[PDB]
Amino acid sequence: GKMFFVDLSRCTACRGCQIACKQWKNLPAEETRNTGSHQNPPDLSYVTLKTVRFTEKSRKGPGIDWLFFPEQCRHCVEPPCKGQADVDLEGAVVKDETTGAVLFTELTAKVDGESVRSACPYDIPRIDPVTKRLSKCDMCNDRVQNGLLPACVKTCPTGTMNFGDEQEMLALAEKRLAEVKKTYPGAVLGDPNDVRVVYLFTRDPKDFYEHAVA
Amino acid sequence: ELQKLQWAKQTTSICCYCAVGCGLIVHTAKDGQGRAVNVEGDPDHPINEGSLCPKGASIFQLGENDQRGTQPLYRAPFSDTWKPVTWDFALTEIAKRIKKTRDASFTEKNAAGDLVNRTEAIASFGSAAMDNEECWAYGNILRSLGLVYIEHQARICHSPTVPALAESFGRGAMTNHWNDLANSDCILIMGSNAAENHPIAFKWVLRAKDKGATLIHVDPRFTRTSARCDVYAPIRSGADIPFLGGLIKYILDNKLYFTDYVREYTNASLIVGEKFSFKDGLFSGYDAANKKYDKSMWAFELDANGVPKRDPALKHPRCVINLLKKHYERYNLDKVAAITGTSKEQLQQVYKAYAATGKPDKAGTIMYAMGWTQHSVGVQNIRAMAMIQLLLGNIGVAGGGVNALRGESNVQGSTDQGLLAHIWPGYNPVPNSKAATLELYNAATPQSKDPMSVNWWQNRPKYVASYLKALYPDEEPAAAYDYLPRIDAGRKLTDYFWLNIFEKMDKGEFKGLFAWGMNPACGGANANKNRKAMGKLEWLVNVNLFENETSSFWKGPGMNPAEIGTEVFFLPCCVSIEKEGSVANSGRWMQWRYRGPKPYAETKPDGDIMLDMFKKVRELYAKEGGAYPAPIAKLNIADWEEHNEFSPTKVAKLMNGYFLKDTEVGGKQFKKGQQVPSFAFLTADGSTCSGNWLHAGSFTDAGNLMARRDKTQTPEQARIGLFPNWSFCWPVNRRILYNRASVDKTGKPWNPAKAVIEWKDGKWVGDVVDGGGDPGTKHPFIMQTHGFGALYGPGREEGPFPEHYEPLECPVSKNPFSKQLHNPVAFQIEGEKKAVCDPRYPFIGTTYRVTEHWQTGLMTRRCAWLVEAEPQIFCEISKELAKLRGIGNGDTVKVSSLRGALEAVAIVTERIRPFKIEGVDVHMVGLPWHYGWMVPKNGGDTANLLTPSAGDPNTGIPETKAFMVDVRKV
Numbered sequence A: 001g002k003m004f005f006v007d008l009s010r011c012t013a014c015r016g017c018q019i020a021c022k023q024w025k026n027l028p029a030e031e032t033r034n035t036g037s038h039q040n041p042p043d044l045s046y047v048t049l050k051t052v053r054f055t056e057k058s059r060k061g062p063g064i065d066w067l068f069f070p071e072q073c074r075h076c077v078e079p080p081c082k083g084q085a086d087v088d089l090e091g092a093v094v095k096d097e098t099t100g101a102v103l104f105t106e107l108t109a110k111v112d113g114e115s116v117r118s119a120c121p122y123d124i125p126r127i128d129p130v131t132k133r134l135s136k137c138d139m140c141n142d143r144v145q146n147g148l149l150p151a152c153v154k155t156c157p158t159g160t161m162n163f164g165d166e167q168e169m170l171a172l173a174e175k176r177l178a179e180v181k182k183t184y185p186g187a188v189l190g191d192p193n194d195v196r197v198v199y200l201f202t203r204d205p206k207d208f209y210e211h212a213v214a
Numbered sequence B: 001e002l003q004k005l006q007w008a009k010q011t012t013s014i015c016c017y018c019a020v021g022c023g024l025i026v027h028t029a030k031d032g033q034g035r036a037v038n039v040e041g042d043p044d045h046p047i048n049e050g051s052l053c054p055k056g057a058s059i060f061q062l063g064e065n066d067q068r069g070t071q072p073l074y075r076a077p078f079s080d081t082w083k084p085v086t087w088d089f090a091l092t093e094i095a096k097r098i099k100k101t102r103d104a105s106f107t108e109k110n111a112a113g114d115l116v117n118r119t120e121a122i123a124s125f126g127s128a129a130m131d132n133e134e135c136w137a138y139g140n141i142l143r144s145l146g147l148v149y150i151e152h153q154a155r156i157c158h159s160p161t162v163p164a165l166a167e168s169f170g171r172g173a174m175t176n177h178w179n180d181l182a183n184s185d186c187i188l189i190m191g192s193n194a195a196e197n198h199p200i201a202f203k204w205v206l207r208a209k210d211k212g213a214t215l216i217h218v219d220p221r222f223t224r225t226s227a228r229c230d231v232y233a234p235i236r237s238g239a240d241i242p243f244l245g246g247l248i249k250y251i252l253d254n255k256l257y258f259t260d261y262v263r264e265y266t267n268a269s270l271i272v273g274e275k276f277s278f279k280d281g282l283f284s285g286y287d288a289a290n291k292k293y294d295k296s297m298w299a300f301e302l303d304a305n306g307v308p309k310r311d312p313a314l315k316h317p318r319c320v321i322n323l324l325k326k327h328y329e330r331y332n333l334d335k336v337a338a339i340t341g342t343s344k345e346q347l348q349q350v351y352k353a354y355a356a357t358g359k360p361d362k363a364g365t366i367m368y369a370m371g372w373t374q375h376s377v378g379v380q381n382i383r384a385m386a387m388i389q390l391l392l393g394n395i396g397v398a399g400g401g402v403n404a405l406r407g408e409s410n411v412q413g414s415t416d417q418g419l420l421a422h423i424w425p426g427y428n429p430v431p432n433s434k435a436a437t438l439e440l441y442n443a444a445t446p447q448s449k450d451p452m453s454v455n456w457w458q459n460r461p462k463y464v465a466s467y468l469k470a471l472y473p474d475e476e477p478a479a480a481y482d483y484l485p486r487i488d489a490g491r492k493l494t495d496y497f498w499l500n501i502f503e504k505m506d507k508g509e510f511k512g513l514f515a516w517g518m519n520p521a522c523g524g525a526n527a528n529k530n531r532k533a534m535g536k537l538e539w540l541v542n543v544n545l546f547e548n549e550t551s552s553f554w555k556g557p558g559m560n561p562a563e564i565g566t567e568v569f570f571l572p573c574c575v576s577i578e579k580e581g582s583v584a585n586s587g588r589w590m591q592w593r594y595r596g597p598k599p600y601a602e603t604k605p606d607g608d609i610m611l612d613m614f615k616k617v618r619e620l621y622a623k624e625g626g627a628y629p630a631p632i633a634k635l636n637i638a639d640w641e642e643h644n645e646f647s648p649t650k651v652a653k654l655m656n657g658y659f660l661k662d663t664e665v666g667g668k669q670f671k672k673g674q675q676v677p678s679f680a681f682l683t684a685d686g687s688t689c690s691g692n693w694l695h696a697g698s699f700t701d702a703g704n705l706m707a708r709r710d711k712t713q714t715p716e717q718a719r720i721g722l723f724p725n726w727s728f729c730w731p732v733n734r735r736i737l738y739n740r741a742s743v744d745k746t747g748k749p750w751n752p753a754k755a756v757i758e759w760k761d762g763k764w765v766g767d768v769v770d771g772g773g774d775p776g777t778k779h780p781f782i783m784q785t786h787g788f789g790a791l792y793g794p795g796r797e798e799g800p801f802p803e804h805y806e807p808l809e810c811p812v813s814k815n816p817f818s819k820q821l822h823n824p825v826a827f828q829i830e831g832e833k834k835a836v837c838d839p840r841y842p843f844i845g846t847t848y849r850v851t852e853h854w855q856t857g858l859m860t861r862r863c864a865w866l867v868e869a870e871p872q873i874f875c876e877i878s879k880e881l882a883k884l885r886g887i888g889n890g891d892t893v894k895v896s897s898l899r900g901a902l903e904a905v906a907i908v909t910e911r912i913r914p915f916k917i918e919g920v921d922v923h924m925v926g927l928p929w930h931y932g933w934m935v936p937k938n939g940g941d942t943a944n945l946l947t948p949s950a951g952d953p954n955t956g957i958p959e960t961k962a963f964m965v966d967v968r969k970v
Ligand SMILES: Nc1nc2c(c(=O)[nH]1)N[C@H]1C(S)=C(S)[C@@H](COP(=O)(O)OP(=O)(O)OC[C@H]3O[C@@H](n4cnc5c(=O)[nH]c(N)nc54)[C@H](O)[C@@H]3O)O[C@H]1N2
Pocket: B018, B019, B157, B158, B190, B191, B192, B193, B194, B196, B197, B198, B218, B219, B220, B221, B223, B235, B236, B237, B238, B239, B240, B368, B369, B370, B371, B372, B405, B406, B407, B408, B846, B847, B848, B849, B850, B851, B852, B853, B854, B855, B961, B962
């Protein structure tokens, strides 16, 4: 299968990835307002498959730790969302056995969406309140199948977003972690044996987002 | 295949936003409407490698936008609605308004009786967003009409950079390029938010860190840049010179300077004359009456040949290096800490990390932009860092240099084409009234009797002659010289610049304004004046993508359309991806881009709009005569046109230039019609034309070098990533300027592992050598008269050394360095008030950008995905100031200055802290200037309602980065 390695030690929160997702899929924009944060949209939704979360952590000296988290479906190796959807109707949630992509179909309309969202340890699924379809990042399975990078991976200027075969991405993740620790001694990989989107966090993953790891 | 791209043609383009110059791939629906279906990165482009920030990644939404202008619109005087009209009506009537205004206002001779052949009744603004060929054509169209009031983005952006670096090194441009950042050992980002405003640049910043580089951010705010840096230090807005003056003192005390570089390649050794002095914030030769200095008092001591004397032992007390040591003695860490708000520990940490690059085989670079330029001391801010870089020997080396990060996609280009009041294309000055002949014009260029000084500007007569041949090929240069308008020698240059154009407009002195690809209603400092002043225009021509705050200033806030006489023409233009041409990026890479989609609706490329407009004016003069027609009638526009329309290729070939006759030059022989292979082969006798001598070498007999997509490199080139076969850069493809300073007197790199050039056998390998000659035979700064990096620079309006002056609105009442609080020659408009320690406006005000929006947001406020991320004007304040004023995070606040007020959403953040200035906490208020009243709903208006119409006495840049404000909860 395929894997993302997301090295957040290089993230500038440019939100290139957030826009590139919407441009590639031609997704609509949400109605947003500033409530005292750069973060927007404030959450994933049925029309937002990726948003960059902003968190300010206090640091004694002049500056802070500003933690950036471009959130997406982890495309779990053994996905609980599928386990839960398959009790109501197989085919609502399927696995691409070549890429590893976990894919919601239009049949998610005819399953307990509430229950499927609850099954996700990363709180990823979002429901269309009209159609009751579940939507999330689809790994740009489209592009990967046609030998292209996912839109958010290609657009990323910093080397945060990396993508390829699971063996080369796991090897990259271990080599990068050792280098990153010289600058960020508390750096860790997010649930690396269970998911296909392996985030490198510079510190406590829960400071990035409460569901950053299981 | 992928359904979305299955029936679309692929074309390459270059991003229409920042001066990084990222490559695009455009997918266009094969037939029918012929619209773009997809825009994303070019994976083969050597700068971005397929990556795009959110502005670039959303170009599809900009291009295929249902709010874009469709056809010309006309607003009759006193009317409250637009009327759709034909291009025929629009261009015909504008041509009549130009002719009518030109005929009534045209001046052959000024009051002094000197020939000036100009109209002072029409001004033009824009644009760095046009192609290089359009910028060049536009300037020459305006100048053939006799305009002198010609300005664009550069005035209010990097205008201070040009004289700051020209004084220091000989040229005004970014010294290195984006890819080169990866070679640096220490990256200082200061007066810059590069992770937000040049995002793809951070690819190369982080690759430098991968190889052991220290990343330093110095900024009043903790930003998305600060988040990735090793060292963050706060600095108070307007306190840059103390910080930099402190580093000079630190370098000199601790002997961290590159001794051999300083001795051989800087003016350290030059003997300053006896008339130079400084005491209590004032240099010698101060004339208080006229608010200017007698710069003659700063002259060097010359030998009998007129060559400045040099003490190679650096012992003479009037040696530049000894006067330098004496000047910055006052900038001790305690005084610098007290005035900056930066702790002595933080200053020392930055100083030690950066000044470590004084070692020959270590390179330090500065990345700076508007945080340094947009001040009353903008030029001196940059001078101080230029001087630091010369002391450490960081100029001319890979991973070194002064990286002045240019703003718009083609602001480098638009400045190169002379869309500023003081310069023709290629930085040949606009003649003044006393330059009565081409001979006298050419007499002004200083000569050097030093056999090691190249003094390349001595070739100017070839460039001016070749420029006049490009415009007027049937006239002798000395005759065509009389066709072009001249400015008054008697006046300060700032009389002809942006802020004084708006002051004159406010007093009714302008009939006509071209707002051509600019939004001065939002982008100009003190915006309320600009909005009122445009009310005093008889006619306004706005050329842009969308209806906007400038096009529709007459139906703006507190305006009565019924009472506003201004006739307005809105002409809708094509987006970047709908046209062909070149754009020059920050590293001077002139990159060719192609048409993907057809023009939207009835929109036109600027090239076609300006050419058909000029043709109508020309045909009106051919029919009914009028004022001095020769410059209009005789202009060579045949070379601009192919198949009845603007020809970027033909214009680009004229800007490069060609032989008007069989010619022998530099030992070689050329047939009439051949392209000029470089500016080395231009002549002063009329044999050659060249629209811009910098472009000579860009489009030769070999083809369009700007269109080269060749990433192959020699091993030497590949070690530092010159990519010399990717597009073309002026001058003659020298990718790192001043690169003779990167080697010793035998031609051996200071840092062989990162060699820019090297002498091998009997030739320079690597980059193109910046100045011909064997090793050790030439001073390395060939565009300088004397040939040296200028530590002491006596050409600058407020002195040959940077000196701390407070912003014109400042939070302190006493300068700790002198008894001069403000720049003693600052550009100010008499009667305009400033809040100097005014209790009504106790907070520092500054303006800046976010990643997701562009300029006034005219473009990005129309793009739903960018609005999504940043929907509303905000106000960033500390928790300390939030508590003082009882403001909660997310509350509506009112920010006010002497000049206006607006409402914004409070962002209360630990990313801002108080500045402890002389032991007292000073609070700041930060605002994005990206918002305007037209769109979106609840977006807010421009931060420029608050900014002052005062600033730098060298370039007249407004002080939009340091003023004084109040903030109240609403
Ligand atoms: N996202 C985005 N990118 C852009 C643009 C845009 O609108 N949006 N516009 C482009 C253009 S035209 C330009 S010229 C460039 C400009 O790019 P920048 O110069 O990076 O732009 P700013 O954000 O205006 O200013 C940079 C930083 O200066 C800091 N600052 C404020 N006052 C001072 C001061 O007195 N001293 C110092 N040292 N720092 C200070 C601010 O806090 C800010 O973080 O960006 C270009 N790229």
